[PDB]
């Protein structure tokens, strides 16, 4: 968005992580998740009420949101390019 709020949780973004305005928690979290190629769950339905309140504890839903917008998953493998 104009004001670079974190596309996922509405936090202040640090940069366009994986091509989308994102915050530090999300930066690392998404990287970890993708590199490991993990999946999670939350104590809510898939349509979890994602807002500022939902800290990075809400891994699953943050990941769903990231995927929904379409964070450039592949870019996570940058450091994995051990040429
Ligand atoms: Zn975030
Ligand atoms: Zn959730």
Swiss-Prot record:
Induction: Down-regulated by aging. Induced by pulsatile shear stress. Residues 31-36 are annotated as: Nuclear localization signal. The modification N6-acetyllysine is found at residue 16. Signal peptide: none annotated. Coiled coil: none annotated. Zn(2+) 2 binds at residues 42, 48, 58, 61. Zn(2+) 1 binds at residues 6, 9, 23, 26. It is found in: Nucleus; Cytoplasm; Mitochondrion. A zinc finger (NR C4-type) spans 6-26, 42-66. Acetylated by EP300; acetylation enhances DNA binding and transcriptional activity. Phosphorylated on serine and threonine residues mainly in the N-terminal modulating domain. This phosphorylation is required for repression of cAMP-mediated transcriptional activity of RARA. Expressed in lung fibroblasts (at protein level). Expressed in monocytes. Highly expressed in liver, also found in kidney and brain. It comes from the Eukaryota. Residues 6-71 bind DNA. Homodimer. Heterodimer (via C-terminus) with RARA; required for ligand-dependent retinoic acid receptor transcriptional activity; association with RARA is enhanced by pulsatile shear stress. Heterodimer with PPARA (via the leucine-like zipper in the LBD); the interaction is required for PPARA transcriptional activity. Heterodimerizes with PPARG. Heterodimerizes (via NR LBD) with RARB. Heterodimerizes with NR1H4; the heterodimerization enhances the binding affinity for LXXLL motifs from coactivators. Interacts with NCOA3 and NCOA6 coactivators. Interacts with coactivator FAM120B. (Microbial infection) Interacts (via the DNA binding domain) with HCV core protein; the interaction enhances the transcriptional activities of the RXRA/RARA and the RXRA/PPARA heterodimers. Belongs to the nuclear hormone receptor family. NR2 subfamily. Receptor for retinoic acid that acts as a transcription factor. Forms homo- or heterodimers with retinoic acid receptors (RARs) and binds to target response elements in response to their ligands, all-trans or 9-cis retinoic acid, to regulate gene expression in various biological processes. The RAR/RXR heterodimers bind to the retinoic acid response elements (RARE) composed of tandem 5'-AGGTCA-3' sites known as DR1-DR5 to regulate transcription. The high affinity ligand for retinoid X receptors (RXRs) is 9-cis retinoic acid. Composed of three domains: a modulating N-terminal domain (AF1 domain), a DNA-binding domain and a C-terminal ligand-binding domain (AF2 domain). This is Retinoic acid receptor RXR-alpha.
